Design a binder for this molecule. Structure first.
Ligand SMILES: Cn1cc(Br)cc(N)c1=O
Ligand SMILES: [Cl-]
Length: 130
C-alpha cells in the first residue's frame, strides 16, 4: 500500500539523519568511506563484509533497510569489523576499537532516544508480510 511505502520512506529519512550525525562526528571519520586497498591491501582478505557509513547511505537509498534492526546489523558490522581487523595492544588499534565501540554506542543511544518502538514494530510487521 502507499501507507506502507510512506512508512518505509519515513524509516529512510530517520536512518539518513542518524547516519549523517555519525558521519559528521570527527571521531568517526575512519568509518565514513570504505578502506582504500592501496593503504590496506590485506583488508578485503581479512574482512569479508566491509561496511562504512558511505555504504550505509547507499543501502538506505537502495531501500535495503526495511527495519531499524537491519540497519543496526550494518552498524554492528562496522564495529565488529574494526574489533577483528585491529585487535592488538598498540595505541593505533586501541584507538580504532574505542572509536568503533563509540560509533555502535552512539547509534544505539540515538535510536533508543528517537525511534518510536511502535514505528519499529510496524516496519517489522510490514517486512514479515512480504
Ligand atoms: C575501519 N578501518 C579503516 C581504516 Br582507514 C584502517 C583500518 N585499519 C580500519 O580498520
Ligand atoms: Cl586521529
Amino acid at each position: 500500500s502507499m501507507q506502507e511505502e510512506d512508512t518505509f520512506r519515513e524509516l529512510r529519512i530517520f536512518l539518513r539523519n542518524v547516519t549523517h550525525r555519525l558521519a559528521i562526528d570527527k571521531r568517526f571519520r575512519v568509518f565514513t568511506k570504505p578502506v582504500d586497498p592501496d593503504e590496506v591491501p590485506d583488508y578485503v582478505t581479512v574482512i569479508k563484509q566491509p561496511m562504512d557509513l558511505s555504504s550505509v547511505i547507499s543501502k538506505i537509498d537502495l531501500h535495503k533497510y526495511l527495519t531499524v534492526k537491519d540497519y543496526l546489523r550494518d552498524i554492528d558490522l562496522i564495529c565488529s569489523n574494526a574489533l577483528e581487523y585491529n585487535p592488538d595492544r598498540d595505541p593505533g588499534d586501541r584507538l580504532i576499537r574505542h572509536r568503533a565501540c563509540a560509533l555502535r554506542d552512539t547509534a544505539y543511544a540515538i535510536i533508543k532516544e528517537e525511534l518510536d518502538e511502535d514505528f519499529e514494530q510496524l516496519c517489522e510487521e510490514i517486512q514479515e508480510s512480504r
